[PDB]
């Protein structure tokens, strides 16, 4: 299992514009297009992102290309962020995947706000951090996904994704 396989379990693959759990316009493998309520604004972001006239629909191929850029940007964001890099560098390979997943879903900013959990993960207090991460809007809004990520930080294994 790797970061790409893991995120594709969590995000899915949709070739037509769709709405987030949050109601936002997305496509592909969790690629948010706009937080704006117009399908028209979304369609315009899509064609800008792909470089063609898409009419709301993309190929597998374009989906994967967007996914490649997004994971690359997530990693680079972690590495550029003062709060995040320090925790990343301290973690093992599997837990590193779990932080990347959070960054992809919520953005750098969002994750950097989990101050106390970050602190516990750096300290390698796995059980405590798992309990603290669960006290969040994130966990309450997307509990099955959050709990997969949380088990990943708790165990350091890919067990939560075996099932799936």
Q: Where are the domains of the chain?
A: 1-164
Any idea of the CA torsion for 25, 31, 35, 40, to the nearest 10 degrees? -50
DSSP-derived 3-state class of residue 53:
coil
Helix-helix angle 82-90:93-112, to 10 degrees: 160
Going by the DSSP 8-state scheme, the letter that residue 1 receives in this structure is -
Report the distance separating Cα 128 and Cα 142, nearest Å: 20
132 is in an annotated binding site: yes
117 is in an annotated binding site: yes
Closest to 28 (Cα-Cα) out of 58, 69, 73: 58
Report the distance separating Cα 43 and Cα 27, nearest Å: 10
Q: Resolution for this model in angstroms, one decimal place?
A: 1.7
103's CB contacts (< 8 A; 6+ apart) are: 74, 77, 78, 84, 111
Catalytic pick among 5, 10, 11, 72: 11
Label residue 97 exposed, middle or buried (CB < 10 Å: 0-12, 13-18, 19+).
Answer: buried
* Catalytic annotation present for 61: no
Going by the DSSP 8-state scheme, the letter that residue 24 receives in this structure is -
Any idea of the CA torsion for 63, 138, 99, 95, to the nearest 10 degrees? -110
132, 116 Cβ separation under 8 angstroms: yes
Catalytic pick among 5, 20, 22, 89: 20
User: Got the DSSP string for 106-134?
Assistant: HHHHHHHT-HHHHHHHHTT-HHHHHHHHT
Report the distance separating Cα 45 and Cα 34, nearest Å: 7
* Catalytic annotation present for 108: no
Q: Structure solved using which method?
A: X-ray
Report the distance separating Cα 161 and Cα 6, nearest Å: 7
Q: Which fold has domain 1-164?
A: Lysozyme (1.10.530)
Structure tokens at 134: 């669960």
| Residue 107: CA count within 13 A, CB half-sphere | 4
Q: Which residue, chain included where needed, has tokens 């706009």? A: 34
């Amino acid at each position: 299992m790797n970061i790409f396989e893991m995120l594709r379990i969590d995000e899915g693959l949709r070739l037509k514009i769709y709405k987030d759990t949050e109601g936002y316009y997305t496509i592909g493998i969790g690629h948010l297009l706009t937080k704006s309520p117009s399908l028209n604004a979304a369609k315009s972001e899509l064609d800008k992102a792909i470089g063609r006239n898409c009419n709301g629909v993309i190929t597998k191929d374009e989906a994967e290309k967007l996914f490649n850029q997004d994971v690359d940007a997530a990693v680079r964001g972690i590495l550029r962020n003062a709060k995040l890099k320090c925790v990343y560098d301290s973690l093992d390979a599997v837990r590193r995947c779990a932080l990347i997943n959070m960054v992809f879903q919520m953005g750098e900013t969002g994750v950097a706000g989990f101050t106390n959990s970050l602190r516990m993960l750096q300290q390698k207090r796995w059980d405590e951090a798992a309990v603290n991460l669960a006290k969040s809007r994130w966990y309450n809004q997307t509990p099955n996904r959050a709990k997969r990520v949380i088990t990943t930080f708790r165990t350091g294994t890919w067990d939560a994704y075996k099932n799936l």
